[PDB]
């Protein structure tokens, strides 16, 4: 959301488009725009966090399962706590003894 | 000799000594083998 929140996508993009329009970008392509394509890139800019567990890889070896996608209890909180989201994701597929 | 005693009880099958606990555990193990790989990791 820090990159493509709907409030940003509306306000900032319409302001940039209006500035481009008043400068005359749509009359002729000479003008240089300033982020008038933000709604086209929703969910693409810094939308993920990938962490490889080096200790787990060292413990497992050459043959291992690669990766897992983990959805948190709160769907839109990883951007607030990147480290907590990664640790909660790594809580899942660990060595287990009972 | 064999026909008409324990040797035909064996043909009868699980009429004499046979417990429910390991039978239920084996059924659960077979179902777990069937369903565990397809259960999600979440």
Long-range contacts of A79-87 (CB under 8 A, 24+ apart): A79/A1, A79/A2, A82/A49, A85/A49, A86/A49, A86/A51
Give backbone dihedrals phi and psi of A12, rounded to 5 degrees, phi first. Answer: -65, -40
What resolution in angstrom units was achieved for this structure?
3.3
* Nearest residue to A4 (alpha-carbon basis) of A35, A32, A25: A35
**CB proximity B16 to A under 8 Å:** no
Answer yes or no: are the C-beta atoms of B11 and B17 closer than 8 Å: no
**What residues have CB less than 8 Å from A95, skipping those under 6 apart?**
A59
Give, in order, the Cα–Cα distances in Å from B25 to each of A42, B18, B28, B30, B33: 51, 13, 5, 9, 12
DSSP-derived 3-state class of residue A73: coil
- State the structure-solving technique: cryo-EM
**3-class SS string, B1-42:** CCCCCHHHHHHHCCCCCCCHHHHHHHHHHHHHHHHCCCCCCC
Contact A38, A4 (CB under 8 A): yes
What's the gap between Cα A13 and its chain centre? Answer: 19
Q: B42: which chain A residues are within 8 Å (Cβ-Cβ)?
A: 70-71, 92
What 3-state DSSP class applies to A88? Answer: helix
Q: How many CB pairs under 8 A join A and B?
A: 6
B39 touches chain A (CB under 8 A): no
The C-alpha atoms of residue A12 and residue A69 are separated, in whole angstroms, by 32
Write down the residue that tokens 């060292």 correspond to.
A58
The shortest C-alpha distance from A95 to chain B (Å) reads 14
A69 chain-B contacts, CB cut-off 8 A: none
Neighbours of A66 (CB within 10 A): 6
Q: Is A38 exposed, middle or buried (0-12, 13-18, 19+ CB in 10 A)?
A: middle
What distance in Å separates residue B37's CA from the closest CA in chain A?
Answer: 14
Residue A36's closest CA among A44, A25, A47, A28?
Answer: A25
CB A90 within 8 Å of CB A12: no
DSSP helix/strand/coil, A35 = coil
What are B34's two structure tokens? 């069937």
- How far does A93 lie from chain B, in Å, by closest CA? 8
């Amino acid at each position: 959301p820090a990159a493509d929140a709907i409030a940003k996508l509306i306000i900032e993009t319409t302001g940039n488009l209006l500035g481009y329009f008043l400068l005359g970008g749509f009359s002729s392509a000479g003008t240089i725009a300033a982020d008038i394509i933000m709604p086209f890139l929703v969910g693409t800019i810094a939308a993920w966090l990938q962490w490889k567990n080096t200790g787990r890889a060292t413990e497992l070896g050459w043959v291992h399962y690669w990766e897992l996608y983990q959805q948190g209890a709160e769907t839109n909180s990883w951007s607030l706590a990147a480290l907590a989201a990664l640790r909660g994701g790594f809580l899942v597929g660990r060595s287990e003894t009972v | 000799s064999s026909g008409g005693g324990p040797a035909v009880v064996n043909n009868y099958g699980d009429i004499h000594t046979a417990n429910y606990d390991e039978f239920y555990k084996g059924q659960q193990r077979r179902e777990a083998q069937q369903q565990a790989p397809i259960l999600p990791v979440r």
